[PDB]
């Protein structure tokens, strides 16, 4: 359903110590989970693996999919950030999320695989910290994502 919401996939990568991977936006001081659009003809899961390698340098063999979200979670952009006169105009995102366990070493994370790298650093953070730190208009989504994944993450410790 074309609703003004652009289809998107997000990635929560965890370890065995209750932590998730938190990535620093390239040349910036702001942080986020990896995320990116789902292309026409693509499944959310295929899009997830693609952006996992493009943004984090990890492949299918480096992770286990522990959980995912069946349904969209939507946020609307802030009115001022709405890019008017663009095609297609986008009033927010509708997102599926995947919870991945990192089963390779931390050294396999490589954020330089693309020619326009999305991030320039990363660090482990406790799994609920992103909920408090994500830009305001994403917070309801992140609350729902982490509440769905919290039990699984903790069952590894
Ligand atoms: N001041 C801040 N602005 C933010 C933050 N996160 C996102 N944004 C702003 O909102 C815009 C949309 O960010 P989104 O993450 O929803 C999708 P984005 O367009 O950034 O990804 P690309 O496909 O790589 O262009 C983005 O271009 C920034 O201007 C943040 O932590 N702080």
Residue numbers in the entry: 3 to 159
Pull text from the paper.
Finding a correct substrate is especially difficult for the Escherichia coli Nudix hydrolase RppH, which triggers 5′-end-dependent RNA degradation by removing orthophosphate from the 5′-diphosphorylated transcripts. In Escherichia coli and probably many other bacteria, RppH converts diphosphorylated 5′ ends of transcripts into monophosphorylated ends that accelerate subsequent cleavage by the 5′-monophosphate-stimulated endonuclease RNase E. Escherichia coli RppH can also remove pyrophosphate from triphosphorylated RNA with lower efficiency. A series of X-ray crystal structures of RppH-nucleotide complexes, trapped in conformations either compatible or incompatible with hydrolysis, explain the low reaction rates of mononucleotides and suggest two distinct mechanisms for their hydrolysis.
To understand how nucleotides inhibit the reaction of RppH with the RNA substrates, we determined 1.6–1.9 Å crystal structures of RppH bound to triphosphorylated nucleosides and/or their non-hydrolysable analogs, ppcpNs, which contain a methylene moiety instead of a bridging oxygen atom between α- and β-phosphates. Neither structure contains Mg2+ cations since their addition to the crystallization solution resulted in the loss of electron density map for nucleotides, even for non-hydrolysable substrate analogs and at pH values unfavorable for catalysis. In the absence of Mg2+, the map for nucleotides was of high quality although the occupancy of nucleotides was refined to lower than 100% in some cases. In all of the structures, the position of the nucleobases is nearly invariant, while the conformations of the sugar–phosphate moieties have small differences. All of the nucleobases bind in the protein cleft where we previously observed specific binding of guanosine at the second position of an RNA ligand. In this cleft, the nucleobase is sandwiched between the guanidinium group of R27 and a hydrophobic pedestal formed by V137 and F139. Pyrimidines are locked in place by a hydrogen bond with S32, while purines are likely held by stronger cation–π interactions with R27. The sugar–phosphate moiety is oriented toward the catalytic site and forms several hydrogen bonds involving R27, Y77, Q95 and K140 in all of the structures. Thus, the NTP-bound structures demonstrate that NTPs interact with RppH in the same site where the second nucleotide of RNA binds RppH.
